[PDB]
Ligand binder design. Structure first.
Ligand SMILES: CCCOc1ccn2c(C(C)=O)cc(-c3ccccc3S(C)(=O)=O)c2c1
Length: 105
């Protein structure tokens, strides 16, 4: 149901926000600080933007919430080197997200 779907999304968002590897993903990247960011990343996303969407009602399905999560990780992979701490955190978070999503559904 919509209620059960959004309940699970709230759980997994909290689990992601509180994860050891969440530290790069808690706010938007600031393109005034990271000058070239919005030339490379055309669709920014982060956990705080997901929280705002969820708490309002902007998601109508669990899959829409999940698509934003995957976009966070895709953006991280596009912008950051795989050997960087941020890049490694993105890979960890993707694996965590996919495992929680799959074990549930
Ligand atoms: C001042 C230049 C900062 O450069 C970057 C470039 C990219 N990122 C990312 C991602 C996901 O691409 C994340 C950060 C980051 C890292 C640690 C703390 C805070 C941040 S952030 C989300 O406030 O930019 C971060 C910082």
């Amino acid at each position: 149901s919509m209620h059960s779907d959004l309940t699970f999304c709230e759980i997994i968002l909290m689990e992601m926000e509180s994860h050891d590897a969440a530290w790069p993903f808690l706010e938007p990247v600031n393109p005034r600080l990271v000058s070239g960011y919005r030339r490379i990343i055309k669709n920014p996303m982060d956990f705080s933007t997901m929280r705002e969407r969820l708490l309002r009602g902007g998601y109508t399905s669990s899959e829409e919430f999940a698509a934003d999560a995957l976009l966070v990780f895709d953006n991280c992979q596009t912008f950051n080197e795989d050997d960087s701490e941020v890049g490694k955190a993105g890979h960890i978070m993707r694996r965590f997200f996919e495992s929680r999503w799959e074990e549930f559904y």
